[model samples]
Structures are given as structure tokens and as C-alpha cells.
Target: PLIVPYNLPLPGGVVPRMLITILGTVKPNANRIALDFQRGNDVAFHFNPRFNENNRRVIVCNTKLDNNWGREERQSVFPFESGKPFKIQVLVEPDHFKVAVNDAHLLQYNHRVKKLNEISKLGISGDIDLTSASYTMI
Candidate 1:
């Protein structure tokens, strides 16, 4: 269970060529984890990882704009473990967001919200203990 959501503020908002890094530890009974980029109440990106769900493993990526969820992109590789530490890196590009888990390339999500600089907030939640989450403009 998550005690509180982790929130980080981007100094200049998120721009193209920026990199965001998240470091955390999954709880022993962790069921799911979610990382999001927000602009006000809208979510520009939603990255979710599910563990041991329906006898399969997957990572779900999506966008929420104007209170509606976009189509979900589900990837079928499980690189994170319960009771283990993890590193998630996200790179902002002109067309898409590149993501990696523990130095391994994970998946990419195309720009659905159009304006990347509008994303000024970073939030993380779920059954995990976060150590550090930072952003660097490249």
C-alpha cells in the first residue's frame, strides 16, 4: 500500500531532450505502480507497471487529456521485481518519450498531448518506496 504519492516539480517544465529519472523499491506485495506527467488536472503521460496480473505481466502506457484516457499501449516484458529496487529513466523527445528500466530500453509513447512544455508536474504512486526522482534538461 502507498502511504503517500510522490510529487516533483519541474523547474522549467518538461521540454524536448529532457531526461527524468526515478529510483524506488517495490514493496513485497506490490501489485501496481504508476508514474505520471501532469499539467494542471490533465495527464500528459501515464506509465503503469503491473505485477502478476491475470497470469501475465505487462506495462501499460497511456495519456489522459481533458478527463479522458487515450488508448493504452501494453508491453509484455517484466523487468521489475517485488521487494527489489528499480531505476526508471524517461527521455523526452520531439515525437515521443523513450523509457528504460534498470538501464534496459523499455518502451516509447508518442506525444499525445502535443505541447510537451505544458507538463510541469511529476507524480508517482502505488506500492513502492521512492528514494529519488529528478529531472534534467538536456
Candidate 2:
């Protein structure tokens, strides 16, 4: 099983119309898990799902540039469960990222950093067991 806090290099970065798929299971009593599309130390997209904070069900999406976090965009969805497996797909578009969980459309996040090809890394962290992750460009 792949452990948490995994970092993988994305050579030549991601262009317009790239798809990333992650298969994982939420740990029992998990609080959160995050997926980040990164450029060096900057985060182009931060996709985080939270399950245990104040008993609220939400996913917080944001970006970090110049060592600062942009305004968080929170989406309310309750499709995830502790100890359950999940498959998440993130598609990179020209202007936004379309995210889906378990074949269901989740949400879209507009690009904060405009240059898509600079996103040269994928980072995963927090309390989840990652089984597999794959990237495809279309």
C-alpha cells in the first residue's frame, strides 16, 4: 500500500486537458486528506476533503502563490465515508479543474495560477491509504 505524503514528479508539467486519478481508502476516523498540484514550492491547486471537523462535510479548494494561500472555496458534499474506498478524478482544463469522486461530478475550481505547464508535481497527504494513482493527458 502506498503511504501518505507521497510526492511524484510530473515531468514537463501538465498541459491543458490532463486527467489525474487517485484510488484510496479513507482511514477509520480520518479527519482529512489532500491532493495538490504543485509547481516547485507553490501549489497550483489544493484539493482537500475533510470529514471530522465540527462534524461538517466539505471540501476546501484553494491555491498557494508566493508563499500565501488564496481565499478558500468550500463545497458541501457528503459522499465520502470513513473506512470506505474512493476513486477521485481530476481533470485539468484551460480555465478550471473538474473534479469527480466515484464517477460522480463533485465540483470545479477555477485556475488561480494561469500557467498550467508549470505544475510539475503531485502531492498527496493526510490520513488516507493510497492504493494507486495515475495520470493521463488528452
TM-score per candidate, chains pooled: 0.93, 0.95
Q: How far is each candidate from the true structure, as Cα RMSD in Å?
A: 2.0, 1.0
Q: Please give the range of 10 consecutive residues that has the lowest summed lDDT in model 1.
A: 1-10
Local distance difference test, each candidate: 0.87, 0.88
Model 2 regions lying over 4 Å from their true place: none
lDDT agreement of model 1 with the native: 0.87
Tell me, by lDDT, which candidate is best: 2
- Displacement of residue 59 (Cα, Å) in model 2 is 0.4
Per-residue lDDT of candidate 2, residues 11-66 (tens digit): 78887778889999999989998999998889999999988668797899999988
